[PDB]
Design a binder for this molecule. Structure first.
Ligand code: MG
Ligand code: MG
Ligand code: NI
Lengths: 617, 613
């Protein structure tokens, strides 16, 4: 696993950086950034020079980009840009030139090779400036030249994508500093060749690797006609069938998240995996904390689990027999929390309320005021109807009466901004397969650390789902208690990375745009929403089923499915409904195509239309 | 998801079918079979003709193969072989010719394309006799010829791998029947073109797809010299770094199981996924039942869970307050079952015994005879030391005294033949990341159905891990209570398929061969095994650490990891040990390489003979 990458973009061409020449509508260096992020890169250091503003503006779209300018770019070569970048590199890394177009498989190849220092090379490209590599019995670099008559053998041609350790970069930089006066325009290939004399730098030769440098006009124009369609074909060969899921459970994911599950087998006890788990714990909690909130006041505890499993974790680990829990039940998640508390014989009372209209906050405060209750359990967003409870009022108020707050945010977390501190939330549960847009398998609880340890002496009500034992064992040892869903957690790492890329606020805006399109269509058709828009989460909408016998949920479902849309049925006993969610990787235009299909069906069964009769004496 | 495939192998070229020409050491049809299985194919129908005995022998190595002979293969074309096969095809399927070598990505492409009828085509191959396809603006098939003069356009060249619906095959066979007399040597390409006039058959053109048919003498060696290395390069571009894990946890898996996680997003409530889960239950229970025992007497209940989760499911769902549970504890799994029973306040007693020596079966029988206990909970294989408890004696004996049997087989199931009926096991737990060689995430309990049903009215001790609620909800509705680990379960399906390919008996023999290599090396090194060989499972071995201060677990571990081997520490406080497992996709040659590395380290610290002056 490579976490960091360096893009060299100091040198000159146009009135443009060559990385910003556009193919298929997007600048080529931006496509390089996208492929790198797709393979799990966390930090991309771009060494800029001529026309730096372009890269500085591109960095505003990708938080992973750090632009570092080589101010002496006109008097130096690529190694100067590299040394300028090198202070920002902490680990093994990928080194790329900005003018490349390449099959992303190369990345996958370089990352999946054991050899720590590894140059990517191709077969005969019969291009213009070829960089030829000379290799030994162990396919390690022995020579490098742009003239074939200078090398004892020719193993391949330099692509411009190389995997290097921080130590190799240190040697390259030391050799560069020693020669700043004699060789001020040294290329990085030279420094790597010299470093290869004391450090084995292997070459991985992909004979038919598809790639091209876009520096000139010849390669620029031959790439659009021959090389780039080849790259697009190769990359789409790995594309997965896109199903647009309109259910609030596992939704549509990006293919990069899908492939994050594909990784080397690892023993979960190893320090690398414990590091992955610590990283996940640290990163997941920040999606539920404002920047102003100290992340150290909170912890994350993960389980191989569904979201309801994390709810059971909270309910069965946070309420001692000494206390009494008040459970708010205005939906199926709250009812499930009540049932869990009941099964465990937890001292509890239930506050039942409507599934599609807001809670009576004054009756809620009246019940808070009795001071009977030590703990409050409630739900932020009930997917049964899409009602959004005002926990920013409910939970601080419960805090005012001395209660500990336990919250289901399984279908709210990462879909909307949250700050547990100002929200007055001590324990918050969520899962990996909802608005974080990962794969199902990991449930987790973000805890106020003080409230979490006050749990330390509670008698255990269970084993696998006990919050404090799970947290403490990984605090003592760098390991989890039992085997975690390793591949699910790799996928979750990439989902977290892409959440940091998209931002929670802009993810909310995307969900809301899809919701707006759907609601506009619902209004245009005369269909009725159960929850008024003021109180709706923009994540799922419950729609009243038409009373006509011509309507069938199965018919609408199969019709939508024939066009790659998966709609969700209703769950209420009181009211016949169907549900449309818009989370996951759904795009607004996909919601409009579905909306066109929905209008087609509803008109076809007589909704929004006059019923014309054609009989006549 | 494509479950079926047809390979046409009727005509001749030598004294063997062309599919059995060998490149890279393996017959090309065997490579095709392996690539198909790797992509999740469950049934391969091979239409045979000349020298069918070769394919009949190949079917002995691959349970997925059904060989059906075109008895009139000398008087028919490829469509006759197809008609012979067509009665054995029930769903959408892949149609492949036997003399093909191809980039396996094509399979992945055809399976992941939404279009139901789909011809795979390549760019200009510049070979002999090429089949050119003429397509409309949709890229749908309108023409087919080996003369470019006859086609209004040239969209690509037919590869010989096609995805088809059962209805399209019905149309081709109907058109074939009426023309058995005039056109007895009809090719399948012709019947497909005829069906394509009334059914849209799309063409997917991978312009640079690497493939060749091995038909003449020219192409065979043009392929060994140029095409086949290209295919190998392309496929290794997708290869995952192979780490050989010697821990009993998640071990080394096949890349096919890894990539089975990559699938179209699906809502778990959809009927296709409920069918996948029903299939998983039905197939998973068979790995713990002999052929003679009725699978209807048993059920499988799955949870998003580790193995300890399944243990907790069993103990917290199978023992009522009215009864009394005896837990055998000769290892960490038994201690964990005891701890769970205690946390849930189960009326329970502990039978403690040595972690590395066999249970005293007579003292145990004496405790059974007390008639104090309604339930017995025990472990088949303790990875703490590799001790294998004689459950074939213990559990039938417990049944003889009227007890309900609860068994941890987390590290035994699918590593050795098991039959719950003759073993007297009522509830058996296991996981997805051990001997089945899948990915972690799914725990499951195989239950005697009658004993499972007497659980129906026990008060629930929990919710997520309650056995009967989980089972009943999926019995009633075709759905699970909560969101299951969908992708882990696709990986588990592929793992089940590969277990059916290998068979549990031969997997046991593979594990035991690795264990034999390791034990021979241990003996040659003078190291001591804590458990006697007759009570060892053969899946993991606990080895006493050398007394020399030159030894460090840290050093041995880093040295092994430096060569892609992951060794496991010991678990006892009483005796300092390290552990070597040999499960997962481990191959004997990899075990032999590890033994050489182990010898190197151990010699470097002095476990060789000492003779000097
Ligand atoms: Mg350049
Ligand atoms: Mg053929
Ligand atoms: Ni009328």
């Amino acid at each position: 696993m490579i976490k960091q990458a360096v893009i060299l973009a100091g040198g000159l061409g146009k009135t443009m950086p060559k990385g910003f020449l556009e193919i298929g509508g997007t600048a080529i260096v931006e496509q390089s950034v996208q492929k790198l992020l797709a393979h799990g890169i966390e930090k991309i250091v771009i060494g800029t020079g001529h026309c730096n503003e372009y890269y500085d503006n591109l960095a505003k779209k990708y938080p992973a980009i750090i632009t570092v300018k080589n101010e002496n770019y006109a008097n130096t070569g690529s190694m100067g840009t590299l040394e300028v970048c090198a202070s920002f590199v902490n680990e093994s890394f990928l080194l790329l030139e900005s003018d490349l177009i390449y099959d992303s498989a190369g990345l996958f190849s370089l990352i999946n090779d054991e050899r720590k220092n590894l140059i990517l090379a191709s077969g005969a490209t019969k291009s213009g400036d070829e960089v030829y590599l000379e290799a030994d019995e162990k396919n390690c670099l022995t020579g490098l030249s742009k003239n074939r008559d200078a090398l004892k053998n020719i193993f391949g041609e330099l692509v411009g994508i190389t995997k290097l350790t921080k130590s190799t970069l240190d040697k390259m930089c030391a050799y560069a500093k020693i020669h700043h006066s004699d060789l001020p325009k040294m290329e990085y290939e030279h420094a790597l060749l010299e470093a290869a004399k004391t450090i084995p730098v292997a070459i991985k030769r992909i004979e038919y690797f598809v790639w091209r440098e876009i520096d000139n006009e010849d390669h620029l124009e031959m790439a659009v006609k021959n090389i780039y369609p080849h790259i697009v074909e190769n990359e789409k060969l790995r594309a997965v069938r896109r199903e647009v899921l309109l259910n609030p459970g596992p939704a549509t994911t990006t293919d990069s998240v899908k492939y994050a599950q594909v990784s080397a087998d690892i023993c979960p006890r190893e320090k690398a995996f414990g590091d992955l788990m610590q990283w996940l714990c640290d990163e997941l909690k920040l999606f539920a904390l404002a920047s102003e909130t100290n992340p150290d006041e909170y912890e994350t505890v993960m389980f191989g689990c569904s979201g309801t499993g994390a709810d059971e974790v909270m309910v069965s680990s946070c309420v001692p027999d000494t206390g009494r829990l008040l459970v708010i039940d205005n939906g199926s998640y709250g009812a499930r929390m009540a049932k869990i508390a009941d099964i465990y014989k937890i001292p509890m009372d239930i506050f039942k309320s409507s599934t599609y209209e807001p809670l009576d906050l004054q009756k809620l405060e009246a019940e808070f005021a009795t001071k009977k209750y030590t703990h409050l359990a409630c739900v932020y967003h009930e997917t049964t109807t899409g009602l959004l409870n005002p926990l920013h009022i409910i939970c601080p108020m419960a805090k005012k009466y001395g209660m500990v707050t336990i919250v289901d945010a399984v279908s709210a977390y990462c879909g909307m901004p949250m700050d547990l501190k100002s929200l007055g939330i001590d324990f918050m549960a969520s899962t990996s397969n909802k608005n974080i847009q990962g794969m199902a398998g990991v449930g987790f609880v973000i805890c106020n650390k003080a409230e979490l340890e006050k749990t330390k002496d509670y008698p255990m009500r269970n084993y696998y789902l006990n919050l404090y034992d799970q947290y403490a064992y990984f605090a003592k040892t760098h390991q989890t208690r039992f085997t975690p869903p390793v591949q699910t957690m790799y996928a979750l790492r990439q989902a977290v990375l892409e959440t940091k890329q998209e931002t929670v606020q802009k993810r909310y805006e995307r969900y809301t745009a899809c919701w707006n399109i759907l609601v506009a269509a619902i209004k245009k058709l005369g269909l009725k929403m159960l929850v008024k828009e003021e109180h709706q989460s923009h994540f799922i909408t419950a729609i009243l089923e038409p009373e006509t016998p011509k309507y069938s949920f199965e018919a609408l479902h199969d019709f939508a499915a024939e066009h790659s849309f998966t709609i969700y049925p209703g769950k209420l006993g009181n009211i016949d409904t169907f549900r449309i969610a818009n989370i996951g990787d759904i795009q607004p235009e996909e919601m409009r195509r579905f909306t066109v299909k929905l209008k087609e069906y509803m008109n076809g069964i007589g909704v929004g239309v006059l019923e014309h009769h054609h009989h006549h004496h």
